[PDB]
Design a protein around this ligand. Structure first.
Ligand SMILES: *[C@@H]1O[C@H](CO)[C@@H](O)[C@H](O)[C@H]1NC(C)=O
Ligand SMILES: *[C@@H]1O[C@H](CO)[C@@H](O)[C@H](O)[C@H]1NC(C)=O
Lengths: 48, 48, 97, 48
């Protein structure tokens, strides 16, 4: 296969490799979260 | 010069050749294909 | 009795979530199609306005070799493009060169 | 510009845009709705 790169460093066909991994939602510890466009600090506990 | 590292380069098997060579800072440091591997780092001038 | 300045526990880890906005490119789903064309009738697909991960794409296609001309594989990571034009076919073994 | 009706067919072909290749898009997504419903509601607005 041949990858032709039109309009390099512009547009919207992007790569998510250098986007922070979702990782794990750490619980019972303080974290500086950024959830869906809003930031803060808090402690997470899982519930149903 | 003594105490300096040579230009980082790598040999890869391409065009059925065993010693096809690739190097950092290509094509030039301004339009570099990747500033991460290039030893020349872009830097704005500070005050003074 | 002096009430000292209120301190705060410094956050340990960071958590980030965002809807990916644009759809996934699914380049692996088009490269892994079992109905591959010959070089005579080569197929073309344009990937525009979508999100992709070449680190995962190479694992999902089982890459034999990857190289770039007038560009580098390291700069594909985190970069945006107007459109990626992709052309594919099976290789007749004696013509690999 | 106008749209056509895929179920009963149309005398005209659909033509609201004439982009030979896909143009730049900042957002693309498909949503589903119950076809048996009689009414649909939509809110569209801008702020900052
Ligand atoms: C949305 O639906 C239409 C019609 O089914 C389809 O042509 C189009 O490719 C879909 N787009 C996305 C982003 O799924
Ligand atoms: C779909 O719409 C019809 C009419 O409003 C309603 O009778 C039906 O229960 C709806 N079905 C679902 C799955 O929402």
């Amino acid at each position: 296969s041949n990858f032709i790169l039109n309009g390099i460093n512009s547009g919207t066909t992007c790569s998510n490799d250098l986007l922070q991994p979702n990782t794990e939602v750490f619980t019972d510890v303080c974290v500086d979260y950024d959830l869906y466009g809003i930031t803060g600090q808090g402690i997470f506990k899982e519930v149903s | 010069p003594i105490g300096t590292n040579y230009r980082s380069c790598e040999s890869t098997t391409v065009l059925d050749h065993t010693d096809w060579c690739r190097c950092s800072c290509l094509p030039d440091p301004i339009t570099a294909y990747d500033p991460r591997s290039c030893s020349q780092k872009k830097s704005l001038v500070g005050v003074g | 009795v002096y009430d000292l300045s209120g301190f705060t526990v410094k956050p340990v880890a960071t958590v980030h979530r965002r809807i990916p906005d644009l759809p996934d490119c699914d380049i692996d789903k088009w490269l892994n199609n079992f109905n591959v064309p010959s070089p005579l009738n080569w197929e073309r697909k344009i990937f525009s306005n979508c999100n992709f991960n070449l680190s995962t794409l190479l694992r999902l296609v089982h890459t034999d070799s990857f190289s770039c001309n007038n560009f580098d594989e390291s700069k594909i990571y985190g970069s945006c493009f107007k459109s990626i034009v992709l052309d594919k076919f099976a290789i007749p073994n004696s013509r690999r060169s | 510009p106008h749209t056509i009706c895929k179920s009963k067919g149309s005398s005209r072909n659909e033509s609201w845009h004439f982009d030979k290749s896909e143009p730049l898009c900042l957002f693309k997504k498909n949503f589903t709705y119950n076809v048996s419903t009689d009414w649909l509601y939509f809110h569209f607005y801008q702020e900052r």
